[PDB]
Amino acid sequence: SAVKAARYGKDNVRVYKVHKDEKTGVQTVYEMTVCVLLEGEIETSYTKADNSVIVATDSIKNTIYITAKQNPVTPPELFGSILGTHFIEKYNHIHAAHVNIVCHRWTRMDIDGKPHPHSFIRDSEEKRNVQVDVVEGKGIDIKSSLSGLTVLKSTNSQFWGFLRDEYTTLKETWDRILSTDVDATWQWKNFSGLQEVRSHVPKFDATWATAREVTLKTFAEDNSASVQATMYKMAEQILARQQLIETVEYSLPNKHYFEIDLSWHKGLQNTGKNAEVFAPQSDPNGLIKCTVGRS
Amino acid sequence: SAVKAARYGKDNVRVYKVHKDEKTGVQTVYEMTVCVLLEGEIETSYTKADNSVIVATDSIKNTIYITAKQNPVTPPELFGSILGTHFIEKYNHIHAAHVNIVCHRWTRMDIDGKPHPHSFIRDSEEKRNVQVDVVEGKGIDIKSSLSGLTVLKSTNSQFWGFLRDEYTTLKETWDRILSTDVDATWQWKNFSGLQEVRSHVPKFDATWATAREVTLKTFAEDNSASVQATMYKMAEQILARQQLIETVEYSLPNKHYFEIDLSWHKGLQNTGKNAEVFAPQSDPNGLIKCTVGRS
Amino acid sequence: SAVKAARYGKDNVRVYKVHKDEKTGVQTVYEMTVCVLLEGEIETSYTKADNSVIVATDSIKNTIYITAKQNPVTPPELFGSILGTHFIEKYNHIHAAHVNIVCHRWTRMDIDGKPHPHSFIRDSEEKRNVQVDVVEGKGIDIKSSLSGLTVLKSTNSQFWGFLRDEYTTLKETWDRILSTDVDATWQWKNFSGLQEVRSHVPKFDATWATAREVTLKTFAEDNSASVQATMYKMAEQILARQQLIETVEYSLPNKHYFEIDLSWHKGLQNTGKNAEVFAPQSDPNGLIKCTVGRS
Amino acid sequence: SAVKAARYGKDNVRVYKVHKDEKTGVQTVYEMTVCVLLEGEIETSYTKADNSVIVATDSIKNTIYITAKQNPVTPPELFGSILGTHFIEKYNHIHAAHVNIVCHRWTRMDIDGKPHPHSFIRDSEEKRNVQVDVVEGKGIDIKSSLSGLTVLKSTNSQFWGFLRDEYTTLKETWDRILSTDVDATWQWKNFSGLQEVRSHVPKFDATWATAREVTLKTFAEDNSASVQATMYKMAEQILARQQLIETVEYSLPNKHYFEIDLSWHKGLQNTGKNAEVFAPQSDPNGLIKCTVGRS
Ligand SMILES: O=c1[nH]c(=O)c2nn[nH]c2[nH]1
Ligand SMILES: O=c1[nH]c(=O)c2nn[nH]c2[nH]1
Ligand SMILES: O=c1[nH]c(=O)c2nn[nH]c2[nH]1
Ligand SMILES: O=c1[nH]c(=O)c2nn[nH]c2[nH]1
Ligand code: NA
Ligand code: NA
Ligand code: NA
Ligand code: NA
Ligand SMILES: [Xe]
Ligand SMILES: [Xe]
Ligand SMILES: [Xe]
Ligand SMILES: [Xe]
């Protein structure tokens, strides 16, 4: 037998950082969960019990806190690139670092119509994420994403004209509820190293904001022919607005809400045009994916 | 042996209802999870296998959907009172109904600064809840609550002057992070029945809004001497603003964020006034409760 | 306003303890999650910002580890009684301690038919729990429980003869699946203090084992007329086998498995006597409770 | 823009099947959660709102139940292969099916030392899984796995001789706790189609059993030099015992248990050789992976 692939490191490292403006007294907080996995010339730790090649996972955890102390943690694309670059430059035998960051929302509170200097609210479990792969001699590959964005529209979704055969019971519809949890990922062109990532720093927050805005607007305004058709429209617009993105991937559950026939009870009408009360279904769910790239 | 207490019913009933304004085209959605448990002269179903006394839990589920079809579902205090009253009036041998409702957020989307007529976002896992106990000949007891409201302030929290003995290692502090998930419950004076609940309908949404506003403002503005002292201030204000409330209960975790000493690494300063990077602790957590009532 | 009730302390304290037999080399591990909440003359911490009355929650956490170091942690009824007694005896102004313990399973591995001296497996998320309330001058009240015991029988469950009215759609059945997660609690007679709890130490593990055995046997062997009837039989037997128990409480979900009609597809028969494939339902679920005591 | 990749289908389809032996009266239950995603000539549903190419996800759900009705559901490798083959053969324009199955434990109860004919217990959240990719003209690729197997050993784990630099605080140790949740995957050689999968049916359950047995034995008996070294030993043995496996992958968290220094309290000794009480850490955790293949 032989080691074909190996990676190891520290997962679920929770980090909080505060920035304090001494001039204005305004404080800003960032909270993230970080995972760092390394690859390189480490096979002998598995095959020969040779720990001399292992940067202890506890040391990786220390390094994450030290790096956060000495560098900005925003945008997360920059922080992940700095963190991953550190490991491949510091250790001769480590040749790749894989950094995943989940950013948690701490939104400044408005108290009496004014932004509060040091109080925050978690408005939703929506996350902003990055995956940064730093590979020695191959640059920095970054995938940025938003996840956990849960939306519903109560009309202006349709689904008809699908294949009907002896396995089909679903009725065609011209008016249904559509609800999903949005997972959207945009993949940046490969960067040659940290200097190039630094040169594009303003694009990271702007592109996140654009991806979010396009998702919400398209969902709300599209008279949707299917999840497939609506998600394609989203991906097309994001690619049009940011030339440094190579691909956009969406993964969308179709969270079903079923009509409830109440006609057995005193002829009560609660289907089709009379549908008012529905039963949200926890499972099963449709799952629709697509990756859109350039011609 | 004898049956000392018994209750049974249906839990985790998910319900969605849509309201459509034909004039404006505006749609409004409500989604809830409902539990109904009944009590009464039902001992023989346990002791003698006498199912004749059992209103099937499946029928309870049907009744919830039928009631939602025929009545408003908001405010939830009113809907729960209607639902509970139904069971004690319909069935001679059922003498109490216990209704718990969790309301999920579907907040209307703003697209280009304008409220969208039929698209919604789940902005946070914060819930608005009710517990309604309808007891034949004893009226309607309602407890209203908010839960899952997660907040953090990065300064203006202190904790010093506590008991110090041979079990104590905690250092006094004049500047710490304070973060919690707020669970707040206000208990209404007993209502004689549905007519009285109906007469107070406008107070339910207003009092929820007041409880939320007081919680957020007090948390943000109090230079907190302890969780205990801050929560008391919240409860005091709510009782002052709504005379029909008898008690206010708060249950608050103290979600700890620990300083990280980095001085072992090149004398890096990250404690006390130099603290920038902290480690959020998943467990253990302080848990502080109090119930405040009138003199 | 006035403080009507207050309690505070530390939740989610994870504790592991190992016992090492030096003679045999056999090691035994215990892992628990502990919560301790205190009550007493502590109102002024809420109303006057007087922290002098507060035993810091961090100190409570220390005390839990110190107590586990110096005392056996099994049976959990004994450990909880020792822990709660400590707080009311140590602190003049603390008059009640409320201790909740969840015990996690670490079951010794069998390797080649022989019990291993120091290796363990988590066989199921079933828990053994205690709630211990130690109240100065009122003794020690203990409720013991098992929870998270998930079972299913594929036949020998029936449900017919229930109330049928205009809200009823459920068909009577003489053969259905019955599946539940068992939550069972037995409440001990009040103990005068630690000496009396110590005198009954052997009864705690034996009664847990009896409660588990009776639950499993009765579930498997009863030709069940309803959840209600089967659970009563369980509670009756436990009370008969242990005179120091005053009440037994069961709380059982009815986790539904629905038939799937496949007759629309080539006349496929999958209902009633031909039912083979079913759809487990995640929600809603029946919920049935009862508390059984002595005549 | 262009569609670079697309797949869609139904996730979280819960299925239960019962087998009844009419001779012996013994019943056997199987419960699974199934996901099926399809690929093929479906781009136009995304780009042109052409639903004619879509096999509705609701129809996929129907097909899963119908297939379970007409075929054995065990071993899951066989069931997944049948299910995936169905879609690529039935639909001209569908060219790949991706089937994921999670099998849930329902273990027959022993009542009074005898196996019960129709009563079952969920002994642990450990799963047996398969991933089956059926690609037209490229055969059937199957990855089998076990996951959620949680183990702990209280001694006979060491970790010393790792890289020490200015980021390192971890002390070397010759005696520590080791606990993990095992995720192990074995990848079968490519099969040409259903006939070949059928010819190897007995190997699937046997290899699962071998993988489980090797994992448990090696974990319990290895005087572990690191997670890396122990996991390699496991993978090596599995490959030696089943020639039709090409690779074995393990992904293991290192779930840390920290010593608690209690010396500040009356010189209490609870570290090194005197360590009895430990603090399980919920996060962060080490994460160690490796893929082992043949020379
Ligand atoms: O087994 C281990 N492997 C590792 O890589 C490691 N790093 N810290 N502790 C560790 N333990
Ligand atoms: O055992 C049962 N008890 C009940 O009360 C019930 N209601 N519907 N199905 C049921 N099954
Ligand atoms: O606000 C607090 N209240 C408390 O009771 C406590 N105990 N430790 N830290 C604390 N902080
Ligand atoms: O938008 C949808 N896309 C689909 O593929 C599908 N299948 N059933 N319902 C559906 N809705
Ligand atoms: Na390197
Ligand atoms: Na009544
Ligand atoms: Na006392
Ligand atoms: Na095909
Ligand atoms: Xe969508
Ligand atoms: Xe607070
Ligand atoms: Xe039961
Ligand atoms: Xe391991």
Cβ neighbours of residue D114 closer than 8 Å, sequence gap 6 or more: none
- Cβ A229 vs Cβ D49: under 8 Å: yes
Is B171 in CB contact (< 8 Å) with chain D? no
Smallest CA separation from ligand 11 atom 1, residue: C227
Domain annotation for chain D: domains and CATH numbers = 1-295 (3.10.270.10)
Q: Which residues of B touch C240 (CB under 8 A)?
A: 1
User: Considering only CA atoms, which of C286, D157, C179, D128 is closest in space to residue B35?
Assistant: C286
Residue type at position C104:
H
User: Considering only CA atoms, which of B247, B240, B243 is closest in space to residue B203?
Assistant: B243
Cα–ligand 3 centroid distance for B174 (angstroms): 13
**Helix (DSSP H) and strand (DSSP E) numbers for chain B:** 6, 12
- This entry's atomic model was obtained through X-ray
Helix (H) or strand (E) holding B293: strand B285-293
- Cβ C282 vs Cβ A282: under 8 Å: yes
User: Considering only CA atoms, which of A237, A253, A244 is closest in space to residue A292?
Assistant: A237
Cα–ligand 11 centroid distance for C232 (angstroms): 9
Considering the candidates A33, A57, A74, A210, report the single residue annotated as catalytic.
A57
Write out residues with Cβ below 6 Å of ligand 3: B 159, 170, 226-228, 254, 286; C 8, 54, 56-58
Going from the C-alpha of D134 to that of each of A245, D95, D99, the distances in angstroms are 32, 8, 8
Here the tokens at position A181 are 């949890």
Q: Contact partners of C by the rule of 3+ C-beta pairs under 8 A?
A: A, B, D
A57 tagged catalytic = yes
- Cβ D31 vs Cβ D15: under 8 Å: yes
User: Considering only CA atoms, which of D150, D100, D144, D145 is closest in space to residue D125?
Assistant: D150
Is A59 in CB contact (< 8 Å) with chain B? no
CB-ligand 4 contact for D165 (6 Å cutoff): no
Residue B77 CB: number of other CB atoms within 10 A?
26
Task: Look up tokens 């009480």; give the residue.
Answer: D277
User: Considering only CA atoms, which of D54, D78, D58 is closest in space to residue D68?
Assistant: D78
Cα distance between residue C293 and residue A140, in whole Å: 68
Cα distance between residue A48 and residue A27, in whole Å: 51
Residue type at position D277:
V
Considering the candidates C57, C74, C210, C247, report the single residue annotated as catalytic.
C57
Relative orientation angle of helices C201-221 and C227-241, to the nearest 10 degrees: 150
Cα distance between residue C161 and residue B50, in whole Å: 8
State CA C231 to chain mean position distance: 16
Residue C165 CB: number of other CB atoms within 10 A?
10
Give backbone dihedrals phi and psi of C276, rounded to 5 degrees, phi first: -125, -40
Cα distance between residue D268 and residue D270, in whole Å: 6
- Cβ D129 vs Cβ D33: under 8 Å: no
Give the active site residues of D: 10, 57, 256
- Cβ D22 vs Cβ A295: under 8 Å: no
Q: D149 pairs with which residues across the strands?
A: D182
Among D26, D61, D213, D276, which would you mutate to test the C interface (most chain C Cβ atoms within 10 Å of its Cβ)?
A: D276
Burial class (CB in 10 A: 0-12, 13-18, 19+), C243: exposed
Residue C227 assigned ligand-binding role: yes
- Cβ D183 vs Cβ D250: under 8 Å: yes
Q: Exposed e or buried b for every residue in C183-222, given b needs 16+ CB within 10 A?
A: bbbbbbeebeebeebeebeebbeebbebbbebbbbbbbbb
State CA C16 to chain mean position distance: 19
Smallest CA separation from ligand 10 atom 1, residue: B227
Here the tokens at position C69 are 């170091």
Q: Contact partners of D by the rule of 3+ C-beta pairs under 8 A?
A: A, B, C
State CA A68 to chain mean position distance: 21
Q: Which residues of B touch D166 (CB under 8 A)?
A: 265-266
- Cβ B178 vs Cβ B164: under 8 Å: no
Here the tokens at position D47 are 């780009």
In order, the DSSP letters of C118-179 are EEEE---S-EEEEEEEEETTTEEEEEEEEEEEEEEESSSB-B---B--TT--PPPBSS--EE
Cα distance between residue C164 and residue B76, in whole Å: 29
Here the tokens at position C96 are 């009640």
Smallest CA separation from ligand 9 atom 1, residue: A227
- Three-state SS letters, chain A: CEEEEEEEEEEEEEEEEEEECCCCCCEEEEEEEEEEEEEECCHHHHHCCCHHHCECHHHHHHHHHHHHHHCCCCCHHHHHHHHHHHHHHHCCCEEEEEEEEEEECCEEEEECCEEEEEEEECCCCCEEEEEEEEECCCEEEEEEEEEEEEEEECCCECECCCECCCCCCCCCECCCCEEEEEEEEEEECCECCHHHHHHCHHHHHHHHHHHHHHHHHHHHHCCECCHHHHHHHHHHHHHHHCCCEEEEEEEEEECCEEECCCCCCCCCCCCHHHCCEEEECCCCEEEEEEEEECC
Task: Look up tokens 């909270």; give the residue.
Answer: A31
CB-ligand 9 contact for A227 (6 Å cutoff): yes
CA-based end-to-end distance of chain B: 43
Length of chain B in terms of residues written: 295
In order, the DSSP letters of chain D are -EEEEEEEEEEEEEEEEEEE-TTT--EEEEEEEEEEEEEES-HHHHHS--GGG-B-HHHHHHHHHHHHHHS---SHHHHHHHHHHHHHHH-TTEEEEEEEEEEEP-EEEEETTEEEEEEEE---S-EEEEEEEEETTTEEEEEEEEEEEEEEESSSB-B---B--TT--PPPBSS--EEEEEEEEEEEPPBSSHHHHHHTHHHHHHHHHHHHHHHHHHHHH--BS-HHHHHHHHHHHHHHH-TTEEEEEEEEEE--EEE---TTTTT---SGGG--EEEE--S-EEEEEEEEE--
Burial class (CB in 10 A: 0-12, 13-18, 19+), B52: exposed
Tell which one of D158, D159, D251 to mutate to probe ligand 1, the residue whose CB is within 8 A of the most ligand atoms.
D159
State CA B46 to chain mean position distance: 33
Pairing of strands B285-293, B245-254: antiparallel
Q: Exposed e or buried b for every residue in C136-150, given b needs 16+ CB within 10 A?
A: beebbbbbbbbbbbb
Going from the C-alpha of A222 to that of each of A286, D51, D151, the distances in angstroms are 19, 16, 51
- Cβ C48 vs Cβ C121: under 8 Å: no
Q: Counting atoms of ligand 2 from 1, which one is nearest the CA of B58?
A: 8
Give backbone dihedrals phi and psi of B158, rounded to 5 degrees, phi first: -135, 160
Among B residues 174-233, those touching chain A with beta carbons less than 8 Å apart: 177, 216-217, 219-221
Cα distance between residue D8 and residue D60, in whole Å: 10
Q: Which ligand is nearest to the CA of D170?
A: 1
Is C166 in CB contact (< 8 Å) with chain A? yes
Cα distance between residue D293 and residue D187, in whole Å: 10
Q: Counting atoms of ligand 4 from 1, which one is nearest the CA of D54?
A: 5
Task: Look up tokens 């920038």; give the residue.
Answer: B276
Q: D224 pairs with which residues across the strands?
A: D157
Helix (H) or strand (E) holding C89: helix C76-90
C75 preceded by a cis bond (ω within 30 of 0): yes
A185 tagged catalytic = no
Among D residues 106-135, those touching chain A with beta carbons less than 8 Å apart: none
Which residues of B does the annotation place in the binding site for urate?
Answer: 57-58, 159, 176, 227-228, 254
Tell which one of B45, B50, B53, B54 to mutate to probe ligand 2, the residue whose CB is within 8 A of the most ligand atoms.
B54
Reduce the DSSP state of residue B196 to 3 states and report it: helix
Does the distance separating the beta carbons of A156 and B118 come in below 8 Å? yes
Residue type at position A159:
F
Cα distance between residue C109 and residue C116, in whole Å: 6
Task: Look up tokens 């409330």; give the residue.
Answer: B245
Q: Exposed e or buried b for every residue in D229-261, given b needs 16+ CB within 10 A?
A: bbbbbbbbbbbeeeeebebbbbbbbbbbbebbe
Here the tokens at position B266 are 């090149």
Burial class (CB in 10 A: 0-12, 13-18, 19+), B266: exposed
